[PDB]
Design an enzyme around this catalytic site. Structure first.
Site, mmCIF file in Angstrom:
data_model
loop_
_atom_site.group_PDB
_atom_site.id
_atom_site.type_symbol
_atom_site.label_atom_id
_atom_site.label_comp_id
_atom_site.label_asym_id
_atom_site.label_seq_id
_atom_site.Cartn_x
_atom_site.Cartn_y
_atom_site.Cartn_z
ATOM 1 N N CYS A 29 -3.638 35.946 -66.922
ATOM 2 C CA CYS A 29 -3.954 36.826 -65.805
ATOM 3 C C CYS A 29 -3.037 38.040 -65.816
ATOM 4 O O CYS A 29 -1.812 37.910 -65.892
ATOM 5 C CB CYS A 29 -3.824 36.069 -64.484
ATOM 6 S SG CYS A 29 -5.006 34.715 -64.282
ATOM 7 N N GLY A 88 -2.189 31.577 -67.937
ATOM 8 C CA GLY A 88 -1.159 32.593 -67.907
ATOM 9 C C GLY A 88 -1.573 33.948 -68.435
ATOM 10 O O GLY A 88 -0.724 34.845 -68.518
ATOM 11 N N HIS A 117 -3.134 37.472 -56.621
ATOM 12 C CA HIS A 117 -3.059 36.031 -56.398
ATOM 13 C C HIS A 117 -1.754 35.416 -56.908
ATOM 14 O O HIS A 117 -1.651 34.184 -56.925
ATOM 15 C CB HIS A 117 -4.270 35.327 -57.023
ATOM 16 C CG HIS A 117 -4.516 35.673 -58.460
ATOM 17 N ND1 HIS A 117 -3.784 35.129 -59.493
ATOM 18 C CD2 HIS A 117 -5.435 36.483 -59.036
ATOM 19 C CE1 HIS A 117 -4.231 35.602 -60.643
ATOM 20 N NE2 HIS A 117 -5.234 36.425 -60.393
HETATM 21 C C1 LIG Z 1 -4.347 33.151 -64.769
HETATM 22 N N1 LIG Z 1 -3.174 33.231 -65.278
HETATM 23 C C2 LIG Z 1 -4.823 31.800 -64.345
HETATM 24 C C3 LIG Z 1 -4.651 31.526 -62.843
HETATM 25 N N2 LIG Z 1 -5.995 31.749 -62.314
HETATM 26 C C4 LIG Z 1 -6.238 31.902 -60.911
HETATM 27 C C5 LIG Z 1 -7.524 31.914 -60.393
HETATM 28 C C6 LIG Z 1 -7.715 32.055 -59.034
HETATM 29 C C7 LIG Z 1 -6.599 32.179 -58.223
HETATM 30 C C8 LIG Z 1 -6.710 32.311 -56.729
HETATM 31 F F1 LIG Z 1 -5.668 31.783 -56.096
HETATM 32 F F2 LIG Z 1 -7.796 31.710 -56.249
HETATM 33 F F3 LIG Z 1 -6.790 33.579 -56.340
HETATM 34 N N3 LIG Z 1 -5.347 32.174 -58.708
HETATM 35 C C9 LIG Z 1 -5.175 32.038 -60.029
HETATM 36 C C10 LIG Z 1 -6.945 31.805 -63.319
HETATM 37 O O1 LIG Z 1 -8.143 31.957 -63.181
HETATM 38 N N4 LIG Z 1 -6.273 31.643 -64.514
HETATM 39 C C11 LIG Z 1 -6.894 31.844 -65.781
HETATM 40 C C12 LIG Z 1 -7.448 33.056 -66.176
HETATM 41 N N5 LIG Z 1 -8.067 33.282 -67.340
HETATM 42 C C13 LIG Z 1 -8.159 32.268 -68.185
HETATM 43 C C14 LIG Z 1 -7.644 30.972 -67.931
HETATM 44 C C15 LIG Z 1 -7.757 29.904 -68.849
HETATM 45 C C16 LIG Z 1 -7.240 28.676 -68.554
HETATM 46 C C17 LIG Z 1 -6.597 28.454 -67.350
HETATM 47 C C18 LIG Z 1 -6.468 29.457 -66.434
HETATM 48 C C19 LIG Z 1 -6.987 30.753 -66.689
#
Ligand SMILES: *C(=N)[C@H]1CN(c2ccc(C(F)(F)F)nc2)C(=O)N1c1cncc2ccccc12
Ligand SMILES: *C(=N)[C@H]1CN(c2ccc(C(F)(F)F)nc2)C(=O)N1c1cncc2ccccc12
Lengths: 300, 300
Positions: A148, A146, A41
């Protein structure tokens, strides 16, 4: 002679952490040999986050679309010479092989299994902890924006066993990711959409191990002569959010050393699920299912 | 985003772990520059444990009484060229300076402060976890035979803040060690004699931080308009096994970000201490005091 949540020394995995950047989005990556794995993603633009076609996005990508950076150790800017997709992951090919690539396999963990996680931000590891792949195929970690690309792993022998890469937080507070074959745990979707996970359940074999650890630590007030068979417990486990108890040799070693039969603890689990008597087990007034039978054998 | 017990990435400390052997006994050691720190009870024979004269033991020893070995990374021929004693620690001088010595400082941690521990056996790290220096100057860790010399540390900025070296296990799950100036936490003696530790107490500022972390995670069923002043709480804390609450700026930020006053949580502590009415605060049926205010600000 105690039981704490323990993680493998991350010195192996820290050297493998890089920062992959694709356009406006940036996340973490795992640098093994000439391969950099990262969640797919990062290709998706914020405009198409709800309906992305990663097959078409991968086509629109070139090797110059991605930027991999090494912040830890001796820094080095990695030139991307190839880009592929395997499930929900990106398989980037870089011109430099990681000189500190440990012996590694890609293995998918089952529910109840525990593994260490190295939380990373901008390609820099900041913390480490241990989580259990919950029966609803989620993990109860501590991830921020961030994070991910943070990697979950094991070490059987001298081989780092990669088993998890952080993909997303569900906005329910639910963290989930995918194995290194691309398949997302729990079949959660990459796209942004309302996703509800299944109901969680207690890992019965981890509670039995945790009770065995309490007995080995001089805490066995809950041990009574009463017993409930594994067959009868699994029937009870269905109607009270509990996993099917599947005995292993690791549990058998705790039964022999303590002298307490497994059926004695299965009965105790039922009584402890109906509440404690005010007494505490290893400093906890609740059933703890985050310690595996192998984790208890190791820490004792 | 979640809240879990989190340890610093042990990569820096793994490169400093060595194995110290003084005749028949063997424990772990910390190799910083040309100095190898290790517990001083390695030079004590098994028959003189009940009453050892370390002043006479240090005299009887020579440089060849000790043998330091590096098992991790590139093994080395570590030759001991000097031996001294500092409190309850041995300050061995070796002929080779550690090429991977991180920027380090020596600091004594106060009760309530958390630090990461790298458990090692025969100079080889096997696991890492986080402990809080309990008010009775003990730690609730997971150490086994040959774990002495394991290091507790922090990382403020780019500097490893060494603050603990494992010395002895007092009871099941009860451990204590010394700071790197030699003074053992809680003045516990090295000899094998009857030693009773003080009564443990809840870290009030860590409970307040842990409740603020629950409020930030949408778990605030315990928050009520009622308040108890810090002065009134400290009187109650004296007769209920609680530490004196001393507010810091880190707690003030949580009070601003959540909107819940510190006095409101002090009242909730006096109510949750009696009991949680079957209600979980971040998946816990007990007051958690293992999360510092700085730990909560970091993980949110
Ligand atoms: C990870 N860095 C971020 C971004 N993210 C995310 C979810 C879904 C998608 C898509 F486009 F649908 F495929 N893209 C990006 C996500 O879930 N994030 C994440 C991950 N773990 C924890 C947190 C905490 C706070 C904010 C974002 C988080
Ligand atoms: C740590 N390596 C061991 C040894 N040990 C110990 C040895 C000598 C002395 C004395 F009295 F100073 F001479 N005191 C202590 C000790 O306490 N050990 C230890 C430490 N942590 C945990 C365990 C668990 C099991 C057995 C020994 C442990």
């Amino acid at each position: 002679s105690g039981l704490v949540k323990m993680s493998h020394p991350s010195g192996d995995v820290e050297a493998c952490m890089v920062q992959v950047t694709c356009g406006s989005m940036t996340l973490n990556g795992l640098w093994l040999d000439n391969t950099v794995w990262c969640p797919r993603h990062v290709m998706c633009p914020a405009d198409q986050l709800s309906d992305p076609n990663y097959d078409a996005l991968l086509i629109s990508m070139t090797n110059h679309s991605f930027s991999v950076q090494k912040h830890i150790g001796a820094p080095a800017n990695l030139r991307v010479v190839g880009h592929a997709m395997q499930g929900t992951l990106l398989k980037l090919t870089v011109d430099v092989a990681n000189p500190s690539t440990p012996a590694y396999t890609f293995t998918t963990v089952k529910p109840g299994a525990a593994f260490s996680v190295l939380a990373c931000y901008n390609g820099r590891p900041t913390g480490t902890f241990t989580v259990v792949m919950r029966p609803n195929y989620t993990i109860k970690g501590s991830f921020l924006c961030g994070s991910c690309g943070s990697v979950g792993y094991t070490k059987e022998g001298s081989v780092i066993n990669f088993c998890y890469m952080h993909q997303m937080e569900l906005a329910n507070g639910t963290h989930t990711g995918s194995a290194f074959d691309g398949t997302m745990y729990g079949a959660f979707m990459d796209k942004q959409v309302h996703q509800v996970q299944l109901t969680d359940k207690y890992c019965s074999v981890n509670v039995v191990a945790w009770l065995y650890a309490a007995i080995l630590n001089g805490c066995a007030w809950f041990v009574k002569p009463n017993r409930t068979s594994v067959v009868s417990f699994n029937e009870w486990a269905l109607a009270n959010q509990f996993t099917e108890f599947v005995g292993t040799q690791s549990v058998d070693m705790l039964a022999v050393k303590t002298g307490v039969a497994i059926e004695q603890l299965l009965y105790a689990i039922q009584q402890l699920y109906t509440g404690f008597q005010g007494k505490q087990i290893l400093g906890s007034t609740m059933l703890e299912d985050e310690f595996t039978p192998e984790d208890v054998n190791m820490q004792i």
